[PDB]
Structure 1
Amino acid sequence: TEQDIISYVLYPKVYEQYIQTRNQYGNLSLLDTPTFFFGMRNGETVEIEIDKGKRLIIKLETISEPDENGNRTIYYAMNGQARRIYIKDE
């Protein structure tokens, strides 16, 4: 967009670092502030309002202990489907 163009011109390092984040996590602005800053508790259900009549219902069921590589398994449910995500514990 034209908005992309002056944005880059105005903030080259920042804007690229923004697009890098967008590529990794999608549109974070949709998240509620508590979720944005703190994530989710065990057993919590969060509803992310994407757009008119479309939303992500997410339940965090449990986080596992880290494997030998320091990776944790997160057991999620999202829109009625079981889901497993791996995060490296820093």
Structure 2
Amino acid sequence: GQPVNGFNKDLQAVILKGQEALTARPGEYLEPVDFEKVRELLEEEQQGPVTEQDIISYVLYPKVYEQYIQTRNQYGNLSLLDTPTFFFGMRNGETVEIEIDKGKRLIIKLETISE
């Protein structure tokens, strides 16, 4: 996005090596995203059902999003952990409770880790 004073001719041309310095608003030259195709190529990666939320999130953050679907594929919904368990796990012989869903609270006690 353009600034208040513009630029200095000699200053701008020397730094740019001579690439197209767009006069217009950066996000006007950028071409519309094929929303249905994202929705369509997001469905072969996952199981099937994909919400509008899933759709923009990806576009906005392509690889960052692909990665989140690796971790919910693995460990489920990690938000449900209390913060200390999320960061540090558990110390030996502790009892922790995790509510994975309304009325499904698992009581987890780690006894010892081995060799």
What TM-score do you get using the length of structure 1 for normalisation?
0.69
**Structure number with larger C-alpha Rg:** 2
Identify the match of residue 13 of structure 1 among 63, 85, 88: 63
Map of 1:79 onto structure 2: none
Where do 1:40-55 residues align within 5 Å? 40-55=90-105
Q: What is the root-mean-square deviation of aligned Cα atoms in Å?
A: 0.7
Q: Which amino acid aligns with 2:74?
A: Q
Higher percent of residues as strand = 1
Measure the CA separation in 2 of the matches of 1:23 and 1:62.
Answer: 27
Q: State yes or no: 1:64 paired with 2:114.
A: yes
* Structure 2 residue runs without a partner (length 5+): 1-50
When normalised by structure 2's length, the TM-score is: 0.55
Q: Secondary structure at the match of 1:62?
A: coil
Higher relative contact order (CA 8 A, sep 6+): 1
1:59 counterpart SS class: strand
TM-superposed deviation, 1:52: 2.3
Counterpart in the other structure of 1:76: none
Residue equivalent to 2:72: 22
Q: Distance in 2 between matches of 1:3 and 1:52?
A: 23
Aligned residue pairs, count:
65
Flag structure 1 segments of 5+ consecutive residues without an equivalent: 66-90
Q: Percent identical across equivalent pairs?
A: 100
Q: Any runs of at least 4 consecutive aligned residues in structure 1 with deviations exceeding 6 A, and if so which?
A: none
Any idea what SS the aligned residue of 2:111 has?
strand
1:31 is the counterpart of 2:81? yes
